[PDB]
């Protein structure tokens, strides 16, 4: 039809770029504890946390760069090129032949990580408005159908990534398991460039973030006859009202982003089931599959909550408010952190006496004789926390904000999620110093047995609990 081709191109680019991002995040921890990189578990977790935090901090900046200048389609194109350039560094590092030419060489992998983070951030910020204005003209129902397709594309890309790419990286090889995400980024860039002919490109109107920055840099508030209009001032006031909810959600984002950086690290030191029983170097169950499981869990209860729980509660009343749902989600993620700490304490008690070796990936881990499935609850808890906090958070942020601040509220949501990831990385670094010594050692290849992830998880749970009590107090006082 000449228009559904543009929507299909947007969906394909979205699927490929989510697939590559999740392929990187699923086994970056395993890769950084590898032959080229004999990093500590704390260092690998910090690197992955910083990477995710960058991917979510660049969303407001990517959106501003797309809206104030450079357009949106061209911004996504340059972001995809930058993202592919960053992706290229990973298979080269994995391959022994090319790692020598590239380079230990921590600067190379840090450059690749920051490049990939900027690309993912800009694409994440700009793709959703791009798809919307691709489909806005037909009508709100067409937009709803396209966004159903977009949601399914995102989830499908994440699922296929966390399954296939993680299995290939952990079991088959890291070179192929990192070239496949690079290949899919290449195809995403190619398909976006090809669909540039059929895309509906809008001129840069100007992001609301520059207006907010001008308001904060003053000429309540000033408003009226001064050099600023009333609606922008009211909108910035609404954003300021929204901000404390995200400030409260920051520790939730820390503990949530722990699911793929330190939870995978703890998985590497549990008895991972072996699912091949055939051929040399028998394949083990990918540590990222748990995350995939959790994602699958979301797919099985996002519609349920949208079709069974929410309508029944709406009919019967007693439906919790957005703030109450956020509090429930923070309680659930606190429970996940506490369960992770309990499991890690039991793991450290067990591994002190006996151990089992696990040559998962390409490095041998002194895992405890504890089943990996004992880590299933905490992961599931985080998933529940998601459907109770993240959505609700944004939902509340959408309730107390005007329609004009669409994609500016969402940008702030991503920014504060990235801030939570950065806070988690900084907390891990702080507890890794000699004064505290929870993660202070010289144990290469991760080898968390000498560290204390139980103390780190307990600290995260305590911070989440303090934040939850403060949130409950302020919600009761205000509402």
């Amino acid at each position, epitope marked *: 039809a000449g228009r559904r081709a543009a929507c299909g191109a947007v969906l394909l680019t979205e699927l490929l770029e989510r697939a590559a991002f999740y392929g990187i995040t699923s086994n970056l921890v395993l890769f950084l504890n590898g*032959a080229p990189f*004999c990093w500590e578990g704390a260092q690998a977790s910090e690197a992955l946390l910083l990477f995710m935090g960058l991917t979510y901090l660049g969303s407001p900046f990517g959106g501003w760069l797309a809206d104030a200048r450079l357009g949106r389609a061209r911004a996504i194109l340059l972001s995809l090129a930058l993202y592919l350039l960053g992706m290229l560094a990973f298979p080269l590092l994995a391959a022994p032949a090319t790692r020598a030419a590239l380079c230990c060489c921590s600067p190379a992998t840090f450059a690749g990580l920051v490049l990939v983070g900027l690309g993912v951030a800009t694409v994440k910020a700009n793709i959703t408005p791009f798809g919307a204005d691709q489909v806005k003209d037909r009508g709100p129902e067409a937009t709803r159908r396209f966004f159903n397709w977009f949601y399914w594309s995102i989830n499908l890309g994440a699922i296929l990534s966390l399954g296939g790419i993680a299995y290939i990286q952990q079991n088959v090889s890291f070179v192929t398991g990192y070239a496949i995400p690079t290949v899919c980024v290449g195809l995403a860039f190619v398909v976006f460039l090809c669909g540039q002919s059929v895309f509906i490109t809008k001129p840069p109107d100007g992001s609301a973030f520059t207006d907010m920055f001008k308001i904060l840099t003053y000429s309540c508030k000033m408003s009226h006859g001064g050099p600023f209009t009333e609606e922008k001032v009211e909108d910035v006031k609404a954003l300021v009202k929204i901000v404390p909810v995200f400030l409260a959600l920051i520790p939730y984002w820390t503990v949530y982003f722990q699911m793929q950086t330190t939870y995978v690290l703890q998985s590497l030191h549990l008895r991972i089931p*072996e699912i091949s029983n055939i051929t*040399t*170097t*028998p394949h083990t169950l990918p540590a990222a599959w748990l995350t995939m499981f959790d994602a699958v869990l979301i797919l099985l209860l996002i519609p349920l909550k949208d079709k069974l729980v929410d309508p029944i509660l709406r009919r019967h009343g007693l439906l919790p408010s957005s703030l109450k749902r956020i509090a429930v989600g923070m309680f659930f993620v606190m429970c996940s952190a506490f369960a992770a700490g309990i499991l890690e304490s039991k793991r450290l008690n067990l*591994v002190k*006496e*006996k*151990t*089992i*070796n696990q*040559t998962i990936g*390409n*490095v*041998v881990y*002194h895992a405890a*004789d504890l089943s990996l499935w004992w880590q299933v609850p905490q992961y599931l808890l985080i998933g529940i926390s998601e459907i109770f906090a993240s959505i609700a958070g944004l939902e509340f942020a959408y309730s107390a904000a005007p329609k004009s601040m669409q994609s500016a509220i969402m940008g702030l949501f991503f920014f504060f999620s990235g801030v939570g990831s950065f806070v988690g990385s900084g907390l891990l670094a702080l507890v890794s110093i000699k004064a505290i010594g929870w993660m202070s*050692s*010289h*144990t*290469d*290849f991760g*080898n*968390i*047995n*000498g*560290c204390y992830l139980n103390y780190y998880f307990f600290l995260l749970a305590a911070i989440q609990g303090a934040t939850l009590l403060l949130f409950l107090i302020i919600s009761v006082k205000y509402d």
Partner: antibody
Amino acid sequence: DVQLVESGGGLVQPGGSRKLSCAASGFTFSRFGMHWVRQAPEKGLEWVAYISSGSSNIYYADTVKGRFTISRDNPKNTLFLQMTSLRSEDTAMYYCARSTTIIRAFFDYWGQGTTLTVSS
Amino acid sequence: QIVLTQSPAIMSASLGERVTMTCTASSGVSSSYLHWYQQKPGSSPRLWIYSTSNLASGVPARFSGSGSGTSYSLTISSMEAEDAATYYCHQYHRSPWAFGGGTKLEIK
């Protein structure tokens, strides 16, 4: 280039203490978690102790659990095994073996071993 | 606690003869973590077969590892004079990593 020498073995009265040292060269001793394995005269090999790359994982055989103590000094690239309450059955040749934390895990390199005799 | 029993504890095989020694485990041992070490008398031990299939560096091709799970085996297609030594099966899977009982191989 890689090599492992042992020292400290000798005659020890029963109930005494002795500290067997293993000097490593030709590789990065910070990596490659080490093992102490003893072989009694005309008996087979017996794994005694293991220490990880960063002393995080430390394990001993049930026969040397409460007596032997394995440690590593990375900056001077050495492996220590200090043993107390020595009895007669501890008389053996001790080797410091190198374990790999790479695609395959095994005792790739062994030292010549040092003989410890616990008798009178 | 896995104990490895080697059968036979001692055997003599003539030159150019089929040689087979078995190593059974008290529990399940992953095939990738079973190794065979060769020890000459008066010399330190040496990896011979890692992951019960792959020959180590310098190992003659006549040697071959086999087996999986509980029972494994080291095999010589055609035994030669330099092959007379003591072979130990070692599981490096579950702590404690006890060695095998040993299998002394002699010329007949």
